[PDB]
Amino acid sequence: RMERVVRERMTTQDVEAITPQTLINIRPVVAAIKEFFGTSQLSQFMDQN
Amino acid sequence: GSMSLSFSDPRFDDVKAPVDECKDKDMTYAAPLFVTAEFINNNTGEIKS
Amino acid sequence: FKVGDTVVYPHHGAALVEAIETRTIKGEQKEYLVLKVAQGDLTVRVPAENAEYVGVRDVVGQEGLDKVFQVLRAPHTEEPTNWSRRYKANLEKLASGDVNKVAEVVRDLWRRDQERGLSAGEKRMLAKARQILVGELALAESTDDAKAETILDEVLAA
C-alpha cells in the first residue's frame, strides 16, 4: 500500500523538488501493524491463570 | 522508468519505555524503525538518501 | 568546485561539499560530489558535469542584496482582483525558486495583510517564503536568521 501511494504521489509531484521524506507515507505500515496486533484472530490475550 | 526508490537497511532504536512502565501507563511496548531510503532520478542522475 | 566551499543548491539553500566522489557507474568514473545541508540532514551526490544543469549555485552577491531590496522597496505593485488567480500566480512565483519572484510574493502579501490581515493559507504562504528568504540573506550577508528577520521586518514598513 505504501508503494502504491508513493508512486502515485511521485507521478503527480514535480521533478527536481521531491525527496523520500515527501514520498513515503508511513500511515499504511502503522495501520497494518496495529490492525494485526490488535483486532486479529491470531493475536490473543495471553491466558495466564 | 525514470525514477526509482529503494528503502533499505532496516534499523531499530531503543525501546521507548521499559516493560513495567508500559504495562502500567497502558503504552504499547515498541521501538522506532529507521530505514535508509534512496531516491534516484534516471535522466539527470542523483541519489536522495 | 573545491572541497569546503559553502555552495548554494535549490531549493535546499546553502550546503557543504564533503568530497569529490569517484563513484563509478557503467565503468565510467563520474566525479560525483557529496553535498549535505543542515536542515534535512540529507546528503546529495551530483556529477560535476551537469551540476550547473541541476543548478548548484553560489552565494548571491552583495549587489543582489540591494537588488531584492529595491524590489522590496519597489512601489506600484498591484495584483489580479480575484485572489485565486493572485494566489496561484505568487505560488508559482515561490515555486519557481527565483529570488526575485519570491521577493515579490512576500512583499506584496505583506502589503496586503499589513492593511487588514489576510487568510491563514496566505499567512503560511508568507511564513514559508519569509523563512527561506531570511535564511538566504542570513547566509548571503552572514547576518544571521534572527537579524535577517528583523531587517526583513524593517524593510516591509519602508
Swiss-Prot record, chain A:
The chain holds residues 394 to 442 of 1177 of the full protein. It comes from the Bacteria. This is DNA-directed RNA polymerase subunit beta. The RNAP catalytic core consists of 2 alpha, 1 beta, 1 beta' and 1 omega subunit. When a sigma factor is associated with the core the holoenzyme is formed, which can initiate transcription. Belongs to the RNA polymerase beta chain family. DNA-dependent RNA polymerase catalyzes the transcription of DNA into RNA using the four ribonucleoside triphosphates as substrates.
Curated annotation (Swiss-Prot), chain C:
The keyword DNA repair does not apply. SMART domains: CarD_TRCF. InterPro entries: CarD-like/TRCF_RID (IPR003711), CarD-like/TRCF_RID_sf (IPR036101), CarD-like_C (IPR042215), CarD-like_regulator (IPR052531), CarD_C (IPR048792). The keyword Nucleotide-binding does not apply. Keywords: Virulence. GO terms for biological process: rRNA transcription. Controls rRNA transcription by binding to the RNA polymerase (RNAP). Required for replication and persistence during infection of mice. Belongs to the CarD family. This is RNA polymerase-binding transcription factor CarD. It comes from Mycobacterium tuberculosis (strain CDC 1551 / Oshkosh). The gene is carD.
